[PDB]
Symmetry: C3
Subunit: 262 residues, 3 copies
Amino acid sequence: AVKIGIIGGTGLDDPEILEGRTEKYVDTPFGKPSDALILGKIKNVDCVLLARHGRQHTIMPSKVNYQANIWALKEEGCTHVIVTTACGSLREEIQPGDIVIIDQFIDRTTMRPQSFYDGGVCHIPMAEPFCPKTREVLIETAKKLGLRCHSKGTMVTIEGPRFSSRAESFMFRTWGADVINMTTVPEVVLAKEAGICYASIAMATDYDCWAVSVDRVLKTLKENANKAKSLLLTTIPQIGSTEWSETLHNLKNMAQFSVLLP
Amino acid sequence: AVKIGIIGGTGLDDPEILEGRTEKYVDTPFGKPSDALILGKIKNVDCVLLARHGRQHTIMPSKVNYQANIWALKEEGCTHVIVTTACGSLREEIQPGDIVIIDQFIDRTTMRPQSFYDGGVCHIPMAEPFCPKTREVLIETAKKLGLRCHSKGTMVTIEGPRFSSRAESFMFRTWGADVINMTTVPEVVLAKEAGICYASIAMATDYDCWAVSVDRVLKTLKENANKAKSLLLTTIPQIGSTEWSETLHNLKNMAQFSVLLP
Amino acid sequence: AVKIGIIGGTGLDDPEILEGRTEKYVDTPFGKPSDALILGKIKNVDCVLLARHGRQHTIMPSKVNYQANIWALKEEGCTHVIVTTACGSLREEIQPGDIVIIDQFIDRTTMRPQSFYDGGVCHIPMAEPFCPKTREVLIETAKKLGLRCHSKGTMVTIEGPRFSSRAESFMFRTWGADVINMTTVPEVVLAKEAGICYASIAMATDYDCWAVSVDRVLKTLKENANKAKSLLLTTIPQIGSTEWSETLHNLKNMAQFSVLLP
Ligand SMILES: CSC[C@H]1O[C@@H](n2ccc3c(N)ncnc32)[C@H](O)[C@@H]1O
Ligand SMILES: CSC[C@H]1O[C@@H](n2ccc3c(N)ncnc32)[C@H](O)[C@@H]1O
Ligand SMILES: CSC[C@H]1O[C@@H](n2ccc3c(N)ncnc32)[C@H](O)[C@@H]1O
């Protein structure tokens, strides 16, 4: 059986997406998650919703307890984790409102714990950071819904809370980055360490500055949130009808063998 | 009315620049500024001088309390902030002794608080980090003084205290950086958050290593400090004769709307 | 006279390399070193061995006390420091098992103290981070041993503990990096500040991901550790037969004049 964890990003964390919801505040060895876990279902698939910045959206990217969030979802029994995230576009073809099913990341964060093994020692591989099988279903589903969707993309995650300078924005383009946010790393890294199939639904809200402002971002998100909701509602039932016995087995093995015992 | 805050950099923090000076030690919600504020005037313009590294120059780049410094200047009523900074040149055309009126930056710092909102949440735009109107006057004034001056430039700020390796120096050139220091970020970022018109007078002291040493840097600064002093003395009266009612209004608005309320 | 400090890296820290060994636990102003110092000799040359991750290899890259390690070696009287380090290859010509006598580095670490002067202020030059005379002997010796050895290379040091993403791996190649590890910085930086001749024997264990895993790395290291051991055993006697009176004098001077007194 599968259980989908869902981490709602800025303006993309509507709990109405789940039926038969039940709130559940939890705790973890790394502190409390951003907010209470929302247990519920999409069709016959068990899901767990968690607002990344809190239902009040008061926690800044740098202060989000990524460790607690991923740990909590794992503890609740989540096999997969699909998240949503607002980001800026670094490519002309990626227009505001467009969905990007990212497949790579470039870390630009500086003050963020990125491992559960803060002391054995865990050196987890990051070649393919996002669950390919889940990304495949998201892409096919976006297509069935007729949505503008990019099948891949490299997300550069900055520390924030400030936005990038134009020089940084142009620089990131030369490094091969396609979109930019403040939350993909270390969320994706910790999910890998937990042996969880992780995928991200990035929602381009602007062209960064290669013009970007809070109001601009919140505005585009409001106008496009429905897309991410529809994609999740349609995608998830499809995951609950596929076999992941082997896929999850490989993630479990990679995570375990990446730990150096004393 | 306007009040110019002046942050003196290494070997470019001579308080003799101001007339009718009065020392004033202050405190802020983020601790004490690098040193006492020096209230005074340049012609009929009120100014506030603050030595970035302390009149004894004992505070290292990484330990400077940028938050307190900017907060203190803002509290004292500063509308503008013009600073001086020693830097290394990453371009052949930028010769030691040359002044560079920087217009962009690339962050390479890692352990520095960059916001006043360390917890609402402030996501301040950084497209145009330096006050264009002030930069314009600095450039025209350098021209009137017959000084070698570059009208723009991208400053990469490293964490320090160590200088860059040759591989990093060459790498920064490929990212589009023109000069390099250890203090522009987050000073410029926090000034933007405070709604202050910020501009920087960068003084190239060497060609970094693409050879750079403390003695080399201090030597070139000693020989060229007079330029920055003359530029400030001549520029400031010009700012006190221009209208900024609208310019300051836009900075105030951008700062305010960049705060996410709980 | 000379005394060679040896910092053993992952799977390259065998104490059997020294004769007439004597364990010696020490303390420093920055805490205790990774493990006890192992005093001994290679022929008639006094050496001091120190396992970077501890004889139990339980300390992760980010948590290694580089300050204490370098301080301890300096206090014991070490004039030179030759280390070994497992790394990933970012160049086709650098094959797993190959030795790389690195000559440059690119810092990608974020949470690491990099100076002994955490408060005067020390701004130490990093143009030529590795001792050229020692690198020369290592290269000639590898040649005499008939080993595959690269005479130079740029090491990019990531924070870890996670490995790089493919996007980061490709990005590092464009920045000019040749190999990648998690320990060169700040070990090399602090050694320079201490006025110590520092050189590194990098052992390529894989092609990173431009596939890399703990087991892959440990496997290649086990199969190739003998090379680093032979190189050290053969190189060190050669250093004890050369003159360094002037070489060490210049390092001492550069370190001293890089300190800003209050
Ligand atoms: C409330 S706007 C800031 C938030 O939106 C995301 N965002 C949107 C556009 C954008 C950009 N151009 N650069 C960085 N983060 C961005 C970030 O992950 C952060 O949590
Ligand atoms: C006392 S020399 C170090 C100081 O001078 C500035 N500086 C000068 C040259 C230079 C360089 N090549 N790289 C980095 N900082 C530099 C830095 O901002 C630091 O506060
Ligand atoms: C036990 S594997 C991790 C350790 O081996 C080194 N290593 C080996 C290959 C490699 C890579 N591709 N990227 C980063 N570090 C690496 C690092 O310095 C770390 O201490």
